[PDB]
Design a binder for these strands. Structure first.
Ligand SMILES: [Mg+2]
Ligand SMILES: [Zn+2]
Lengths: 104, 52, 225, 136, 468
RNA sequence: UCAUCUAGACAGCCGGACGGUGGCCAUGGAAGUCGGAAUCCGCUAAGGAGUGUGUAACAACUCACCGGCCGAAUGAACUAG
RNA sequence: GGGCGUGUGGCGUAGUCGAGCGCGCUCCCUUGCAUGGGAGAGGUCUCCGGUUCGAUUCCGGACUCGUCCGCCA
């Protein structure tokens, strides 16, 4: 849900037809003034590919940086990361089928 | 931004049409054949390409 | 203010306008923005005259102006001379100059007190300048540039000169004119500063492509704050 | 002319066809300009594209400094020497053909102009009027 | 017509300058009017004017402002147009407008606001709290041209009652201070001006100019309200603590010494108030900057910094008096800086500069900051000697030389040394010998009579007749 | 050549379009609708272990089926003048 | 214009889908009519896509080079 709040915030700033660098400066200023929604964001924004990046706590003090598409839901981005996981497994099985004949 | 209802009303006349593949004619969205003679009233129609 | 203005796209305002303390002259073929800049900034205290000199839209390079007097070339017609006589206040004196170089804005760089001229002007024209303008005259070149009016912008407070000017020439001209001078550029690096802009005691008007450091140099040397 | 024109120009009698060599009036170190093209000229069979006063041309430096030779550059005609009529009906002419070097936007490569220039050129190009000594 | 929502501002819940429920901020990124609010505006014509105001290009901005002004002029026709919604929006944009580089924009913006209040008198009261500080900042700006007309207009708005103008200072003092605080602490030069279209310089120049206006505002505020220091101490401490005001005092570079002069006046005011004594650390911070300033003053820029110097010296005397040249005490190199400064100052002497120097001397001798015979007297001799070279080729130098003599005679009376008196006599004769016109400087000559005794001068005449 | 048809057909409106059951595998999830197989009953006038939209999965909407109005022919595929 | 083939280290050159040698010179050792020896550096295998598990290697396209054939009375 908090990722959806961050997305709604960035999309509301986008829908004002505001300049991207001014949006990044607004994120920096609100991070300095201690807004949580701003402080969850990482500043090199990929608005050219409609993608933001967000910091999530690994343990419920280390934070991980995850890229979120603005045109899909947060659950839909999670399903994309699951899909990239699932495609990686099939290539690994193809490698395991390769190993014996290749090394022979 | 126009308004949502007003965008719908303008897109009813500008965007919700069909295009004949042979002669590029702008056609009614529920049409089955082109109304033009030069393509021979063909049934090769496609939806008009939307944005987004 | 150094006011950003164009003459229909032209970033050279000194070519198409002549600004003194007492009056202003603008070309007849001008845009609404170009007239509105002088009308808003100058106000109703200072007359603005739409004029043509010798049948030409260029008036700043054709004429040399002062608060006490105005100099016009020989080719200026009687209708233009009478219109300037009616539109101008009674204080200023308008006198035709009969001289071969004939482009007085290019030839003469002048202010209220002291003037720089082309070295090769005629002695009768020098005495005519000293009479009508009431201004002491020096024949000097700015680092070998004979067109001192085109290559210098001068006011009472200070002066802007050509960028490629020798420093020794800078203190020599500064001591000769009794004003501080700065070498600088106008209109995104154009060398012709006097053709680039017009200035007086409280206003400077320049082209739109004049950058912010150049505008800061202008307001610093002319003390417009 | 074309792009860098400040206003329009009345028709001046054309005096400089392709292949004409004119004096180089400015202080850029070039001695003469050789006209190979006229900007804005039309198309007719066998007709040479000719230039008048105030026109922008394409020219090469035939005689002058070697960094100016052997390349094409824009030029502006400032003295015509073929007599033309104004709308006040005086027929006037200089005694030589002369032009200056410029970029495609029209600002001068040089810094000062020797000799007179025409008012039909000085009104149309402000940089030429800026560096011009006498305008007639 | 207008789309998008200011969600981030909502998370903040900060009204900035505004007391009407709208964040008002000088910075470009935030405080822009809400799209929903913009939609609410009464007429399409107004909406367009606002959109144009948002756009970056100046010509468009000006055009829009001119249009807005015209609408205000026909108030009766457009009274419906002007509404609280309009006011909320205007206020948000007005702040950004006042910081605009272009003078016309600032002037017009101020004029518009004043006009609105005059027409909407007693209907703008909720919004007055936001507007008055801003209007005042315009009336108190370093540029005379923006400030003076604004001031005249403000007076007309309140029916030319001086008391009302003063009342504004008193009534909105809390608000005014808040504005000053926001510029000084909340703001940064980068926040004020967008980096892509502005260089590191200029942006720097701009922040300084705005802050300078804020300092000017503070001075008037202190003068108007005596208890302002006591009521606003916590905030004042914060404003003072920030290094920004202190950064303003740089003469090393920068076009205007006008800004520098303003800071000195503030420091002077603080000492007079006793606020600087109240927070000694703050006074020390200011003192250190003053020391840095002395280094900045240099021969290369002496011509540029010369008008400002007498003022620096007079202030220095007053500050030194506090805590026994305590100001000098903080810096081990204060003397070293003074020595360098003296040499630089002597090379070019401002009119009245020497009178200031003597006042500093009056202060210095009591705390013995400087050795008079080795340093003070000789430096002065060097200065008059330099003036003697500068005999009076240029204007005023004549006044300065006479002025120096008046000061030098006072310097000698204090010296009480035979060598010093002898040196003075030699210099006096030499000055006359170098020549000038006694008649031209007749007033100076009347002052000059003391150096050669009246009877001695008659004897002097006999010696002169004897001269070949 | 297949089908439907005064025991009410095809268009057009309006209403329902349900339970066992989130049927079995498989997935971090997939409940009619990512796929693999099966694809059966009840209540019925009638409703697919689903025609699409559809959500992370739901929810929701629509379908092909049955009903009121209409009262009589109509739908699909193909052939050749 | 068209066809056919070609492209490897600073240079030349070997490549069956699983980049070596020689020459230039880096260093060291070792010598009159100045050698030899030993460890070195050196490639986006012309480039871009697909196949494979991995392409110098297979395929498609582009660039480049080299050959061959081509206007009239
Ligand atoms: Mg031919
Ligand atoms: Zn068709």
């Amino acid at each position: 849900p908090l990722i959806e709040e961050v997305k709604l915030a960035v999309q509301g700033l986008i829908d004002q037809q505001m300049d991207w660098n001014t949006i990044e400066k607004l994120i920096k200023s609100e991070q300095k003034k201690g807004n949580r929604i701003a402080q969850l964001l990482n500043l090199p924004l990929n608005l050219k590919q409609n993608k933001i990046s967000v910091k999530l706590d690994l343990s419920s003090n280390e934070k991980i940086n995850v890229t979120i598409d603005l045109g899909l839901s947060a659950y839909a981005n999670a399903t994309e990361y699951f899909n990239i996981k699932k495609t990686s497994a099939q290539k690994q099985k193809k490698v395991e089928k390769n190993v014996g004949k290749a090394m022979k | 931004i126009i308004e949502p209802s007003l965008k719908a009303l303008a897109s009813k006349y500008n965007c919700d049409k069909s295009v004949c593949r042979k002669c590029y004619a702008r056609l009614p969205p529920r049409a089955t054949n082109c109304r033009k003679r030069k393509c021979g009233h063909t049934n090769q129609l496609r939806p008009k390409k939307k944005l987004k | 203010m150094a006011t950003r203005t164009q003459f229909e796209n032209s970033n050279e305002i000194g070519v198409f306008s002549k600004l003194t303390n007492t009056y202003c002259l603008v070309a007849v073929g001008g845009s609404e923005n170009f007239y509105s800049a002088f009308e808003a900034e100058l106000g109703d205290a200072i007359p603005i005259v739409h004029t043509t000199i010798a049948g030409t839209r260029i008036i700043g390079r054709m004429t040399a102006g002062n608060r006490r007097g105005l100099l016009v070339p020989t080719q200026t017609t009687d209708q233009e001379l009478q219109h300037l006589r009616n539109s101008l206040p009674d204080s200023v004196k308008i006198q035709r100059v009969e001289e071969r170089l004939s482009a007085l804005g290019n030839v003469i760089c002048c202010n209220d007190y002291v003037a720089l001229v082309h070295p090769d002007i005629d002695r009768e024209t020098e005495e005519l300048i000293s009479d009508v303008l009431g201004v002491e005259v020096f024949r000097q070149t700015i680092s070998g540039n004979i067109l001192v009016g085109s290559y210098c912008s001068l006011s009472n407070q200070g002066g802007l000169v050509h960028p490629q000017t020798s420093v020794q020439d800078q203190e020599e001209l500064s001591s000769l004119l009794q004003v501080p001078l700065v070498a600088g550029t106008v209109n995104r690096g154009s060398s012709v500063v006097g053709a680039g802009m017009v200035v007086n005691d409280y206003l400077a008007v320049t082209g739109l492509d004049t950058t912010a450091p150049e505008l800061s140099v202008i307001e610093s040397i002319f003390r417009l704050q | 002319s074309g792009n860098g024109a400040q206003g329009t120009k009345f028709r001046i009698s054309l005096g400089l066809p392709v292949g004409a060599i004119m004096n180089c009036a400015d202080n850029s170190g070039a001695r003469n300009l050789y006209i190979i093209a006229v900007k804005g000229s039309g198309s007719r069979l066998n007709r040479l594209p000719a230039a008048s006063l105030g026109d922008m041309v394409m020219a090469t430096v035939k005689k002058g400094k070697p960094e100016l030779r052997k390349k094409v550059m824009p030029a502006i005609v400032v003295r015509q020497a073929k007599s033309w009529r104004r709308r006040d009906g005086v027929f006037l002419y200089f005694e030589d053909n002369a032009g200056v070097i410029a970029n495609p936007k029209g600002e001068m490569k040089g810094s000062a102009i020797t000799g007179p220039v025409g008012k039909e050129c000085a009104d149309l190009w402000p940089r030429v009027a800026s560096n011009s000594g006498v305008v007639v | 017509s207008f789309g998008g929502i200011n969600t981030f501002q909502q998370y903040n819940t900060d009204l900035g300058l505004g007391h009407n429920g709208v964040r008002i901020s000088l910075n470009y990124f935030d405080g822009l009017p809400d799209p929903s609010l913009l939609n609410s505006l009464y007429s399409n014509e107004l909406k367009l004017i606002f959109k144009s105001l948002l756009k970056r290009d100046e010509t468009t901005k000006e055009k829009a402002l001119m249009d807005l002004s015209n609408l205000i002029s026909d108030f009766n026709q457009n009274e419906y147009f002007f509404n609280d919604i309009f006011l909320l929006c205007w206020s948000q944009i007005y702040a950004k407008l006042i910081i605009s580089d272009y003078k016309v924009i600032r002037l017009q913006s101020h004029q518009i606001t004043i006009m609105l209040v005059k027409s909407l008198r007693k209907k703008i009261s909720k919004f007055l709290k936001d507007f008055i500080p801003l209007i005042l900042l315009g009336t108190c700006e370093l540029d005379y041209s923006v400030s003076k007309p604004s001031l005249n207009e403000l007076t007309e708005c309140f029916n030319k009652d001086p008391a009302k103008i003063n009342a504004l200072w008193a009534v909105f003092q809390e608000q005014l201070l808040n504005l000053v605080k926001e510029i000084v602490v909340n703001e940064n030069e980068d926040t004020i001006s967008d980096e892509r279209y502005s260089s590191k310089e200029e942006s720097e120049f701009r922040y300084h100019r705005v802050i300078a206006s804020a300092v000017l505002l503070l001075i008037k505020l202190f003068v108007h309200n005596k208890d302002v220091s006591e009521r606003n101490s916590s905030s004042l401490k914060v404003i003072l603590s920030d290094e920004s005001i202190w950064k303003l005092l740089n003469l090393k570079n920068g076009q205007n010494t006008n800004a520098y002069e303003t800071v000195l006046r503030l420091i002077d005011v603080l000492y007079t108030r006793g606020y600087m004594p109240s927070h000694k650390n703050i006074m020390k911070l200011a003192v250190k900057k003053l020391l840095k300033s002395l280094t900045h003053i240099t021969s290369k820029n002496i011509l540029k910094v010369c008008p400002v110097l007498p003022s620096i010296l007079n202030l220095l005397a007053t500050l030194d008096d506090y805590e026994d040249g305590t100001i000098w005490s903080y810096d081990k190199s204060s003397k070293e800086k003074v020595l360098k400064f003296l040499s630089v100052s002597r090379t070019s002497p401002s009119p009245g500069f020497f009178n200031a120097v003597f006042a500093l001397y009056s202060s210095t001798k009591r705390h013995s900051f400087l050795d008079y015979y080795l340093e003070w007297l000789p430096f002065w001799q060097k200065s008059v000697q330099r003036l003697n070279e500068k005999g009076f080729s240029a204007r005023n130098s004549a006044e300065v030389l006479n002025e120096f003599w008046t000061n030098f005679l006072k310097f000698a009376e204090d010296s009480s040394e035979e060598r010093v008196k002898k040196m003075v006599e030699s210099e006096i004769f030499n000055s006359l010998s170098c020549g000038k016109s006694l008649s031209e400087y007749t007033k100076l000559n009347q002052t000059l009579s003391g150096v050669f005794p009246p009877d001695k001068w008659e004897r002097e005449i006999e010696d002169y007749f004897t001269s070949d």
